[PDB]
Design an enzyme around this catalytic site. Structure first.
Site: not given
Ligand SMILES: [K+]
Ligand SMILES: [Mg+2]
Ligand SMILES: Nc1ncnc2c1ncn2[C@@H]1O[C@H](COP(=O)(O)OP(=O)(O)O)[C@@H](O)[C@H]1O
Ligand SMILES: [Cl-]
Ligand SMILES: [Cl-]
Ligand SMILES: [K+]
Length: 378
Positions: A7, A68, A172
């Site tokens: 992640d 990001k 996600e």
């Molecule tokens: K995270």
């Molecule tokens: Mg997150």
């Protein structure tokens, strides 16, 4: 083999590995199950993760975070232009593409967002390797459901650069649903709502699942709402308090403010488990130590509007998915901030008492699901 699930988060990253039918969320060298998506540069070294965030208060200009928010975007991108004004580090334009510029070993250097992220992924790769005692090559890396092809490509390149073979880039919210086994088929379609409140962003995703196939019905949220915003409400509260007790304003001392933010972040986590938290900072300003405390009730009041506001994106997501509250089969909590009792009450009350899928640490759910999928694709 084994393949890992990573992640790559806005503020924290997490890695997991699926072995013997169980997912192991891997702890780093400091024993933390999540690692700051931070990288720092100094006169003599390059720091990643905890080491980097631990010295952010003294080295704001060369400590990079939020990569990001830049990944896969052009310099002329309106969000890039807005975000730049808020970061302590420099973002420069190179042939139309953004690059963070820092000082390292006395020389000026620039890195593409994918390079900064490759450093974070390398750290995650080594964390998994330290635990497995074997080389880690294959991985599934996650991205927000709204990422476009360029952002997905850039995230995959960050992996490649880190020495990883990215088996696949998945969303996600989908990874979170896989963590809870919601991708198993047992008849007709199921509507799953993912409430994701992390350290920097907030998103609500409605997915429809049938025959193990996911369909993103709608997405909503606020890319600029996260746990760090709750920390700031606390920082201001205490700046006001330190001012009353010592007739001194610490606002312009960047280090003191960042150190107070860290103490608040820690107090906040405690308030999710206890009703009170103690703040004890030594030499906060001009040698004056700050020893105080805060209650859950007060913490909730300082953030009442922000907490309550998380419900708007929930209504909008349902509206755009053309679904009513009642049509949502499962509600999944993702993001460390979803551990806040008051947020769970708000979401739960909104869904008229419906139980929340929250047995898996919210800040680990995405990595958990990515690890499961990595094993499957492996
Ligand atoms: K995270
Ligand atoms: Mg997150
Ligand atoms: N127990 C907790 N209670 C409240 N907030 C938490 C808790 N654990 C983590 N958080 C918050 O979650 C945020 C970042 O972690 P997540 O794991 O949410 O990261 P990311 O922003 O990359 O998705 C931070 O704001 C952090 O303070
Ligand atoms: Cl580490
Ligand atoms: Cl309430
Ligand atoms: K999030």
């Amino acid at each position: 083999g084994p393949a890992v699930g990573i992640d790559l988060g806005t503020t924290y990253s997490c890695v997991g590995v699926f072995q013997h039918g169980k997912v192991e969320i891997i702890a780093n060298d400091q024993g933390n199950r999540t690692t700051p998506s931070y990288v720092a540069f100094t006169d003599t070294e390059r720091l990643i993760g905890d080491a980097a965030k631990n010295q952010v208060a003294m080295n704001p200009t060369n400590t990079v975070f939020d990569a990001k928010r830049l990944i896969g975007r052009a310099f002329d991108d309106a969000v890039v232009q807005s975000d730049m004004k808020h970061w302590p580090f420099m973002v420069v334009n190179d042939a139309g593409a953004p690059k963070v510029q820092v000082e390292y070993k006395g020389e000026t250097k620039s890195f593409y967002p994918e390079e900064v992220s490759s450093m974070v992924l390398t750290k995650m790769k080594e964390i998994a390797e330290a635990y497995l005692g074997a080389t880690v090559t294959n991985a599934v890396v996650t991205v927000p459901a709204y990422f476009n092809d360029s952002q997905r490509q850039a995230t995959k390149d960050a992996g490649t650069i880190a020495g990883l073979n990215v088996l696949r880039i998945i969303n996600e919210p989908t990874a979170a649903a896989i963590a809870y086994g919601l991708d198993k088929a047992v008849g007709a379609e199921r509507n799953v709502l993912i409430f994701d409140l992390g350290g920097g962003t907030f998103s609500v995703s409605i997915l429809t699942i049938e025959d193990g196939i996911f369909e993103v019905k709608s997405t909503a949220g606020d890319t600029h709402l996260g746990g760090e915003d709750f920390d700031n409400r606390m920082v201001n509260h205490f700046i006001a308090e330190f001012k009353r007790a010592h007739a001194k304003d610490i606002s312009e001392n960047k280090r003191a403010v960042r150190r107070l933010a860290t103490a608040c972040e820690r107090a906040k986590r405690t308030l999710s488990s206890s009703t009170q938290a103690s703040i004890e900072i030594d030499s906060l300003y001009e040698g004056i130590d700050f020893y105080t405390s805060i209650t859950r009730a007060r913490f909730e009041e300082l953030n009442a509007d922000l907490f309550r506001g998380t419900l708007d994106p929930v209504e909008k997501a349902l509206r755009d998915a053309k679904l009513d509250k009642s049509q949502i089969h499962d509600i999944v909590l993702v993001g460390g901030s979803t551990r806040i009792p008051k947020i769970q009450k708000l979401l739960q009350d909104f869904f008229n008492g419906k139980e929340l899928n929250k047995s898996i640490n919210p800040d680990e759910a995405v990595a958990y699901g990515a690890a499961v999928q990595a094993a499957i694709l492996s």
